[PDB]
């Protein structure tokens, strides 16, 4: 029976700038969605989940809670304006006008989707034409591509030579924002957080600190989001400079590389 518990997380105390993507002012349109990369920081998702000003907070791969117990290598953040009736469209396995033509969320997307109303900040009297959406596109989009080209369309057998008219339309048109319409036409801010994991040292992790390690005892351990129970001892095996954890045959973790020291420890099942 285990006696103590040990945890070991990196020596980093840099707060992650999550407010820059949320609290900024000028945000791009849908078919030119911005992308931000996040790494080498510590983040607290409890305050993000407990905001009380969040119309839609839906996400997959991880539970809304418990998320402070995981470590990832990178974080990607995207943001765009979507009309009220089409917030549902930003979700895996959905077919629609904007998702299929402007930005399609991959099916295996392990991450979170946030959407909230900002009608008091972007609605303009007389028509806000600053935000625009692509309406007319020729081909479907594979996950995670950005299209910027605005070449004229040829929807018929007669080329228009770059002149709008019959069988030739401008793919880009204005939203037509007005605070006097119904709920469906109202805008909503949409932000997508993506996650990834590879065989490389973790960069962005969760809160809570580490403790001193012990050996030659049956102890419950948690190394960088990997939980187990056993006896930690000293061993000797080849470890490539970047590979983190190595496993013995039959998918049993045999050796782990301790962060903050680059030491190699061996796990033996206590009996």
């Amino acid at each position, epitope marked *: 029976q285990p006696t103590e518990s040990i945890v070991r997380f990196p*020596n*980093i105390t840099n707060l992650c700038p999550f407010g820059e993507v949320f609290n900024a002012t000028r945000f791009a349109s849908v078919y030119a969605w911005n992308r931000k990369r996040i790494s080498n920081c510590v983040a607290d998702y409890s305050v993000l989940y407990n905001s009380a000003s969040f119309s839609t907070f839906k996400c997959y791969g991880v539970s809304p809670t418990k998320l402070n117990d995981l470590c990832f290598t990178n974080v990607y953040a995207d943001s765009f304006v979507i009309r009220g009736d089409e917030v549902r469209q930003i979700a895996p396995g959905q077919t629609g006008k904007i998702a299929d033509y402007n930005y399609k969320l991959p099916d295996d997307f392990t991450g979170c989707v946030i959407a909230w109303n900002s009608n008091n900040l972007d609605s303009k009297v007389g028509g806000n034409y600053n935000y625009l959406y692509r309406l007319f596109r020729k081909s479907n989009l594979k996950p995670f591509e950005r299209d910027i080209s605005t070449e004229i369309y040829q929807a018929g057998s007669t080329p228009c030579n770059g002149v709008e008219g019959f069988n030739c339309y401008f793919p880009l048109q204005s939203y037509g924002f007005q605070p006097t319409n119904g709920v469906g036409y109202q805008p909503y801010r949409v932000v997508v957080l993506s996650f990834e994991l590879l065989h*490389a*040292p973790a960069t962005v992790c969760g809160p809570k600190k580490s403790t001193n390690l012990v050996k030659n005892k049956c102890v419950n351990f948690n190394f960088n989001g990997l939980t187990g129970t056993g006896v930690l001892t000293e061993s*000797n095996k*080849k*470890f*490539l*400079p*970047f590979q983190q954890f190595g496993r013995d045959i039959a998918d049993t973790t045999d050796a782990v590389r301790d962060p*903050q*020291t*680059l030491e190699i420890l061996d796990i033996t099942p206590c009996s």
Partner: antibody
Amino acid sequence: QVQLVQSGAEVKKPGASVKVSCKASGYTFTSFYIHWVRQAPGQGLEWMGIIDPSGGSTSYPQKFQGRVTMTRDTSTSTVYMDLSSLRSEDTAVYYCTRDGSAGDNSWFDPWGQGTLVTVSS
Amino acid sequence: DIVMTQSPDSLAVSLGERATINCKSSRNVLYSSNNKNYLAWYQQKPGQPPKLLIYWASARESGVPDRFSGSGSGTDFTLTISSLQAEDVAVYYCQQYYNTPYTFGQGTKLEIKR
């Protein structure tokens, strides 16, 4: 061919930062690793980091964990060794080497010329 | 990490005689499934970056003469220079590459007896 060249010597007051560039030429820049070593005047060699192109770790020993920062660049094919919080015991010569022959291997074959860094008041 | 101890610290050898420098380790640095040691012997002259001289502990790079050799296994290794000339005065280091520490040696200067 298969050569690395660095910048010139620097002398700075304590508390400032240091940036050193290791320009590479001759091989495929994104197929080998690169390490940085330092040499105190009259002492033995040391080891202070590792980095690989195409994205990857920047691993340090215990005493260099929260001080050194080693960035990466492509196209220009350069590496950087941003170092902060200088002290009086940092006056040394810095070399940048690569791995060679892949796998788990060190073989620091093509050393650079190394730059001299002095910290004084 | 691995603590590598190299002795003797300094030595003086006449022209045309043997010379041996020993580099010990702290943990066994061989590897089953491959049977390959993991060591490297360098050489540094003043105002010059160190240049690789011996690798794998039993092989030499191209261009190095036959006067330099290398033998050993397990924990202790040796150089055994064959013939000493006037241009072989430098500082020698030993380094291992099986663990993250990348530990090296201490340095053994050479002189000429007279």
